[PDB]
């Protein structure tokens, strides 16, 4: 009914369903090997109801890995990179009994990385940063090291391409956060850094943005998800002093300023957690750790769901929750139901003729 | 169930095992074979309290889940005298 606690997993979203795969957990007894959760399973969380469904996947199943990068385009999962018991990986997997598909793309694939970020444009997948072995851009060493590559993959024809960078690219880093708002591909934090950059996905030009005023503390293993066309949402992180973070920020894009966001989860800091935006103005974050991750035997991996109410809910959702609340009372009531209204709605959404049987 | 203990007089530490149902009087006889002192000349203590001879180890507060071989429960011992357990050395901090 609930996935095992994990960190370093991937969570993708279509607006109403959240897909969770991979990650790793700490064993009960202290040891020197991490426990990677089974490759065979994929967890789906319904953001309207709050329950989980576990489906086992066959086919070209990718190995159990952590720190991978995933994206959900038209309910089609794209997975690249990560880290397993043998080392880093540069293999690219896709997933629409569901079957994983290992695709041999044209062009030159990137190196084996993890803790990177990704952007989604019209039909291109744009990956940035990471950490891994030696193979455009730079590659600073720590045998692995931080990354600057901006590899691009076309989903229409499956060709690995790299863009011509105009402007100052950001520094090598991993465990950064990426968010997409229109043609802007945002980066923030990592290494714990505090810089804020965006890349124009249309002109392929790097830009540096310097917010004015109070700014979030430099962090790693944070989450950055857009909550509007002019707002980004940052939660959690990992300071330079390694202090876990339970604070949330809202970054206005047009005004280029930062505002703190209040929430009832100040007692539950998270790092290496995933975050997904719902269609009801919420940010759903799952997994991550509350303790210090560097000490693996003392890690406290979480399987909880934290819901931030960033935007007001729709009138449909508000009314439906009122109906759900007053279920018994309304079952003994009656109300008018104009046919033209009902037919207009059922024209848009359809009506199932087999229900109730 | 088995409980694993440390019996500390002043600077002497006795590692020994016993059951929850075993009396603390029986624990004194274990000390007798090791330190050659009859039970009436001994007095065992927990953190601060004194244990009556008839009470069992589990009745005194020594459950199996706390008195483990890798982390035995401490039992103070006084002869015939105020109980005084000297601490061990201190590891250098990092």
């Amino acid at each position: 009914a609930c996935p095992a606690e994990r960190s370093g997993h991937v969570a993708v979203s279509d607006g109403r369903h959240m897909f969770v795969w991979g990650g790793y957990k700490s064993n009960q007894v202290r040891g020197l090997y991490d426990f990677y959760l089974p490759r065979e399973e994929l967890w789906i969380y319904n953001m309207e109801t709050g329950r989980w469904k576990k489906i086992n996947t066959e086919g070209d199943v990718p190995p159990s890995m952590s720190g991978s990068c995933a994206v959900c385009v038209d309910r089609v999962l794209y997975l690249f990179g990560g880290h397993h018991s043998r080392g880093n990986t540069n293999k690219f997997y896709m997933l629409d009994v569901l079957q994983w598909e290992r695709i041999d793309c044209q062009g030159i694939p990137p190196s084996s990385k993890d803790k990177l970020g990704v952007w989604v444009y019209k039909n291109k997948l744009i990956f940035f940063g990471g950490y891994g072995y030696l193979p455009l851009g730079t590659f600073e060493f720590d045998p692995r090291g931080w990354n600057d590559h901006v590899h691009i993959l076309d989903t229409e024809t499956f060709t690995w391409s790299q863009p011509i960078t105009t402007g100052k690219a950001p520094s090598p880093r991993a465990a950064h956060a990426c968010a997409t708002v229109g043609n802007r591909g945002f980066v923030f934090g990592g290494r714990r850094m505090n810089d804020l950059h965006y890349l124009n996905l249309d002109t392929w030009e790097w830009n540096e943005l310097i917010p004015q005023g109070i700014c979030p503390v430099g962090r790693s293993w944070h989450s950055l998800t857009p909550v509007s066309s002019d707002h980004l949402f940052l939660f959690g992180g990992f300071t330079t002093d390694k202090q876990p973070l339970s604070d949330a920020w809202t970054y206005c894009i047009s005004k280029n300023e930062w505002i703190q966001f209040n929430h009832p989860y100040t007692e539950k800091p998270r790092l290496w957690h995933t975050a997904c935006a719902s269609d009801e103005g919420e940010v759903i974050v799952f997994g991550g750790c509350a303790n210090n991750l560097l000490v693996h035997h003392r890690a406290a991996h979480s399987n909880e769901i934290l819901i931030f109410s960033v935007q007001p809910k729709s009138l449909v959702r508000l009314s439906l929750e009122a109906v759900i609340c007053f279920k018994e009372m309304l079952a003994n009531s009656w109300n008018c139901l104009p046919k033209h209204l009902l037919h207009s709605v059922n024209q848009r959404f359809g009506s199932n003729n087999t229900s109730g049987s | 169930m088995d409980v694993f203990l440390m019996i500390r007089r002043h600077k002497t530490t006795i590692f020994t095992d016993a059951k929850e149902s075993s009396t603390v009087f029986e624990l004194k006889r274990i000390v007798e074979g090791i330190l050659k002192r009859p039970p009436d000349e001994q007095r065992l203590y927990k953190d601060d309290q004194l244990l009556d001879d008839g009470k069992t180890l589990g009745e005194c507060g020594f459950t199996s889940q706390t008195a483990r071989p890798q982390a035995p429960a401490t039992v103070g011992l006084a002869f015939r005298e105020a109980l005084c357990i000297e601490p061990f050395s201190s590891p250098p901090e990092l």
């Binding site: 729709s314 009138l315 508000l318 009314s319 439906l320 109906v323 007053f326 | -």
Partner: protein, 87 residues
């Protein structure tokens, strides 16, 4: 700029055009002013207009969003009206 939403029983609700765009249905009907609702009564449409001002005010708001009260006796009417209006 203001727009006028007219209920089935003949009430005229004049709201800000930006607020009325909260409903996708109203947005499509205005795109190219008045909008007529022959099947939404005023006790429902007035509640919808209150949601318009509530939704716009607390969108991208730093302070916590308050609860929107919905009386049980109008919940099902409001749900159907909201689905028709797409808001």
């Amino acid at each position: 700029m203001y727009v006028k939403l007219i209920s089935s029983d003949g009430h005229e609700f004049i709201v800000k055009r930006e607020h009325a765009l909260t409903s996708g249905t109203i947005k499509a009907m205005l795109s190219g002013n008045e909008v007529n609702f022959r099947e939404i009564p005023s006790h429902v449409l007035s509640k919808v207009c209150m949601y318009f001002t509530y939704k716009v005010r607390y969108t991208n708001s730093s302070t916590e969003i308050p609860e929107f009260p919905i009386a049980p006796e109008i919940a099902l009417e409001l749900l159907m009206a909201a689905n028709f209006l797409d808001c």
